[PDB]
Amino acid sequence: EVSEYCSHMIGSGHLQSLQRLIDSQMETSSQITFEFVDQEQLKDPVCYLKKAFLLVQDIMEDTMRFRDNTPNAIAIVQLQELSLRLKSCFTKDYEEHDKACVRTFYETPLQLLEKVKNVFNETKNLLDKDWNIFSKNCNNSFAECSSQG
Amino acid sequence: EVSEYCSHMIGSGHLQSLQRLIDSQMETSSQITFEFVDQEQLKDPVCYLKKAFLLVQDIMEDTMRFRDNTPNAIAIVQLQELSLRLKSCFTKDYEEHDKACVRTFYETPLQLLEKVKNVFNETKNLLDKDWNIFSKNCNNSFAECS
Numbered sequence: 001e002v003s004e005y006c007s008h009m010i011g012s013g014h015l016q017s018l019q020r021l022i023d024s025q026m027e028t029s030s031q032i033t034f035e036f037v038d039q040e041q042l043k044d045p046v047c048y049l050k051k052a053f054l055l056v057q058d059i060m061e062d063t064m065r066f067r068d069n070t071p072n073a074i075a076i077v078q079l080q081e082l083s084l085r086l087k088s089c090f091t092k093d094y095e096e097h098d099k100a101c102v103r104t105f106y107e108t109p110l111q112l113l114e115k116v117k118n119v120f121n122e123t124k125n126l127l128d129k130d131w132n133i134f135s136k137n138c139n140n141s142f143a144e145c146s147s148q149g
Numbered sequence: 150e151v152s153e154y155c156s157h158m159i160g161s162g163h164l165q166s167l168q169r170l171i172d173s174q175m176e177t178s179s180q181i182t183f184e185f186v187d188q189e190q191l192k193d194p195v196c197y198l199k200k201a202f203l204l205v206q207d208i209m210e211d212t213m214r215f216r217d218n219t220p221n222a223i224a225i226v227q228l229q230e231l232s233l234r235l236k237s238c239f240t241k242d243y244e245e246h247d248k249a250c251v252r253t254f255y256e257t258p259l260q261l262l263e264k265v266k267n268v269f270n271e272t273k274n275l276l277d278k279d280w281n282i283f284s285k286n287c288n289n290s291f292a293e294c295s
Contacts, residue, residue: 023216024174025174025215026215026221026258027216028258065177066173070172071172109179113175
């Protein structure tokens with residue numbers, strides 16, 4: 001079940017952690033490649049975040065990497081712990097729609113980090129309005145995407 | 150004027166702060182371009198650091214940029230202040246030789262930060278050995294560079 005366990009689960013400390021993450025990065029024009037949800041393909045706000053929340057998990061595990069026991073590595077662990085708690089708040093969608101709406105991006109680390117912060121921030125905002133919002137069936141939204149990863 | 154006060158300017162807090170900078174950088178394939186001293190051209194330890202000390206000031210001003218008032222931006226300002234004090238410890242070498250021993254690098258921000266930390270670390274170490282050491286005339290060392 002999705003349940004009231006979902007409401008208020010993403011806290012302000014989580015967002016401040018994301019912000020300190022962003023603020024400590026040296027500013028660079030250097031771009032990196034990553035997979036993320038293509039907003040131009042998936043425009044519905046709820047299903048965008050349903051898909052994006054899942055990808056953020058891969059992004060944290062493989063891309064947002066820091067030295068053991070540094071403040072930023074600790075924030076990632078907390079965001080991963082938080083994401084595990086959040087997994088019962090997103091209803092599962094069809095497995096045929098796993099790579100739909102995903103594309104490779106060529107963007108700076110700061111732009112990737114802003115995408116991740118926006119996912120956690122907007123997920124928190126919608127959960128605070130309705131703890132059941134991510135029980136939405138997004139199979140038709142994913143089917144309307146033009147491409148796949 | 151070079152003086153005994155040189156051996157007291159770079160503190161442990163400056164290095165620990167540099168380490169905290171390094172520890173906060175995300176491990177990523179993102180590489181950046183910068184100008185720095187070539188260790189292969191300038192192998193003499195003292196003249197390497199005379200050259201590297203000047204270049205680190207451009208790197209801090211133009212490349213190691215952080216959003217204003219963040220912990221890392223403040224650390225950079227403090228390292229810049231510290232460098233301003235250290236300039237009394239380095240005698241001038243011929244202007245002749247400004248871009249000598251310098252080449253472009255394409256390395257990660259972590260690698261650049263390690264290069265900067267090593268300059269401050271080795272400078273502190275040598276000043277602790279002879280606070281007059283960077284009065285050395287490095288004009289001939291700079292001349293053998295490519």
